[PDB]
Subunit: 291 residues, 4 copies
């Protein structure tokens, strides 16, 4: 069934669902083959892989293109981390159109200003979007959809910006009232206190998504206990990939030889396998003169 | 000094030089920080990361764009693996122009047909380009350069295609006579016999580059002994990166928790560090109203 | 209604249908407003507007992005002139999937080699693709489409390459048998004799498309009499735009004033209307708090 | 000679210089052939030709790729109309580095918010950027260029936004002090009174650029008398091209024939000449074995 429908069911299941980050077509295929039911198109990981910062440096179409290759390499839905929507309601609704066309399942937008600053920094400025304004941006995206199953997740940055539960709840309520398919409540505390607080006051008004990067020590069953609908593992493949490349590059640099890595890395045939080279081999058998 | 000049010196040093593969801006930065003096813009790794095959599926401008992000993230030269030049002499000379503009240091072109098939496959067809034709393609690229230090490496695929030393030498001689900055002699044997054979007959007519992926057991000092000018570690960061992502994704998938990977992967701050987030922090200090 | 279907109906209709060249989003929208039921995404015109040659210099993705903007600005189908398919069957089938996703209604592939040379050149070598290979490339595109109505037009360049009816017919038959939704029979003659001979020998095996650029004085009812399914007006909007820009630029350059061009060009409000600025105005009243 | 230098000489010259709007590689090459010494990479015209609005819908990289093709097709400098810089100082400085790499000679940034609205609209809100912030954005672009001759033009939208000379002058002075190579003072009046008043109060602090679109009946020598350094013909080639396409399409649509357009548009050989096909012919004799 449609990737959009797959993601919507997930956001709406009372069951706790999990999406894993991917940041390129290769990693999207890997996450798929692992069994994950959804993919998180991480804004940080996509910017990082390109070698730029997570501050809207690469253009929205450069992001979308990375996402197109990812969509093509995967059968499970991708929820794009669309930052603040790359501009106003009009830039956001144009983004949704391009997203739908590429097979991307949903877009997550955070209530800050363009260009944004990664939520994980401390001390940095985290100005928030006006509430009525942001809600209308959420509504324009929903209003503008062609496929009714496409998802719009509204990310509340109130705790991240030093505001309280009061603000967090007003904005979550507003975004939900504007048609958001789920609310992503964010927090950068090493514990889940902001989340516990929010979930308690929310009174299960709608599905809630969380990103436990900072409070990763919290047992997952606690999230189930709170009634969270989905958890996003945000940037670990990007992070694992950097450890590997630094370790590998240093070893080859030091040895001036491949002997100490050849057996610690996937083979060339595994690469060809993940690129689905065999399919092409079938196709050439069928579409090229035998002689 | 120019990245082009840096690469040219390397190809011309009698000293054995080493370039390491990178396939995105993040990995190009990592290879740089490791001490490598050059980067191999692997056609396989760039296609693989995008989730496609190494058969000219992504367009040449999609490849060039990945390469632009890589160039921007690095101070050392990048030698692009330009497949067969993405078409005829005209498609190749247009490519050189775009390459020079992006700060890419050189392009390597192999003597096969567009679209190509990865040299590492066995049994697959590996038709070779006509010799006079290919040589003229090499000359048009050199002829068409603006920066005289830009490098054109001619990759001979004769051994790869099942031909002998005789063919390999005629084509190497032709490509060198056409102005190539070095000849990349290829082989997929688990030993360096084709290379030993070629080096013996070449009589050090010009610089020779090799890719020891398949005969990786050969001691590097043997290459020095043969008078090889450069060695290319072709696809190991891509390969290390896939092992890491598969391992990481499987662990999180199984645990439904981050506990068993958080300490096995680079931190978020290391990510911010490789994106040079601090530079931006300086810049905002300088270009944004304090209040 | 659906673009691929609209284009497939036109190729299959008994009546002579017409599509007009557009080369950017603006020209596609003008073509639609004029009433044309389809657009020819001219390779010559897309390459020319970019300032490059009709020699596969711009990549296939740069062509596809121009086409995406064109598709976004129109409701009628666009038939892309996809040269030789930008490489082999695999390059063609990847292109078909991207075109379907961007809303393009079909692709037209010609039986020459990558990179190609424009058909209108006199004396330029026009090496033809092997018949079997090209027919397998057509079948590949057909086998790979996900919209059953997406069309694939196979263009025969035999007459263009200096060959005869024999070659042209063998080629057209192979491609049709491969599954082409229509055959584009090409000729650079100032008369329609190559087309007449082909139409006679064809026995109406399937829909035929033609491009009267060089034999334009031929009365259009004659094409109808021949059973021709579609005519393409191939590069006239591009050519008209160059005349217009060349004139306006010269005028302003000479006068160092706009007084003599201001009354001869459309108003800025017309540009806004063509850009659909009123739709933004309506969205802004809903969504700008 | 070098494009950035050529553009910097024009801004600094005492004489009234002129640049003409181009919106794609083809129009840039025509503009150059006409003799113009520089090109205005119009935001309105680039967006319009794509079929989208002048509201930062196309991304900044899509605009930059149109500009790259334009730059590749011309020897004279292009001044890009870069709207508000496509975001904050960081988005502007990244854009400057890409423009330098693609051969673009300079950027023109206006003191409004991202995403912007075209200045010519009547009644549309035109919220201005904070003076200090915008001045720091200009300084950032200046601090970040690697070619010292690359130009940065700061556009003052005060009059456009409904403000007075006071606001317009404070803004122009801040930006100039920030390092702008020239100030573009804008007005949508049918007369040049806003420009006259500004020029009087300016005391020739630095080069001023103007865009006479709405006050075009003003005699050009009057701008010279005012000490104006450069005039931009902002959207006339785009507007001329729409008139031409609209006419040609209608004609062909009505006639279902090319006989009445064939004699009114440039030849296919002219398109080849503009594409520089003869250069390919010369390369093919050297390099095609
Ligand atoms: O960018 C990301 O991964 C995020 O915001 O979670
Ligand atoms: O693509 C590659 O890495 C190669 O050819 O070595
Ligand atoms: O490019 C074109 O317009 C053609 O081939 O007809
Ligand atoms: O977009 C344009 O042409 C302008 O602002 O002048
Ligand atoms: Mg993010
Ligand atoms: Mg390769
Ligand atoms: Mg064509
Ligand atoms: Mg503008």
């Amino acid at each position: 069934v449609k990737k959009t429908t797959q993601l919507k069911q997930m956001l709406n299941s009372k069951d706790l669902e999990f999406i894993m980050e991917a940041h390129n077509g290769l990693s999207a295929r890997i996450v798929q083959e692992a069994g994950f039911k959804g993919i998180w198109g991480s804004g940080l990981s996509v910017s990082a892989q390109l070698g730029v910062r997570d501050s809207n440096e690469a253009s929205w179409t450069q992001v979308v293109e990375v996402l197109e290759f990812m969509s093509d390499a995967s059968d499970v839905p991708i929820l794009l981390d669309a930052d603040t929507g790359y501009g106003n309601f009009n830039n956001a609704r144009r983004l949704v159109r391009k997203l739908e066309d590429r097979g991307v399942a949903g877009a997550c937008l955070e209530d800050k200003l363009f260009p944004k600053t990664n939520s994980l920094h401390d001390g940095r400025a985290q100005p928030l979007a006006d509430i009525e304004e942001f809600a209308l941006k959420i509504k324009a995206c929903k209003d503008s959809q062609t496929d009714p199953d496409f998802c719009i997740v509204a990310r509340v940055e109130a705790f991240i910006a030093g505001w309280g539960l009061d603000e967090a709840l007003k904005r979550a309520e507003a975004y939900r009232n504007a048609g958001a398919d789920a609310i992503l409540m964010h927090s950068k505390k090493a514990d889940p206190s902001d989340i516990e607080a929010f979930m308690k006051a929310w009174n299960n008004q709608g599905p809630v998504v969380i990103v436990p990067t900072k409070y990763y020590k919290t047992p997952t069953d606690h999230f189930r206990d709170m009634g969270v609908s989905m958890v996003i593992w945000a940037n670990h493949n990007l992070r694992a990939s950097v450890s590997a490349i630094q370790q590998t590059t240093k070893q080859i640099y030091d040895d001036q030889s491949l002997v100490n890595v050849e057996d610690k890395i996937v083979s060339v045939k595994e690469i060809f396998r993940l690129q689905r080279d065999d399919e092409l081999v079938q196709a050439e058998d069928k579409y090229l003169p035998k002689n």
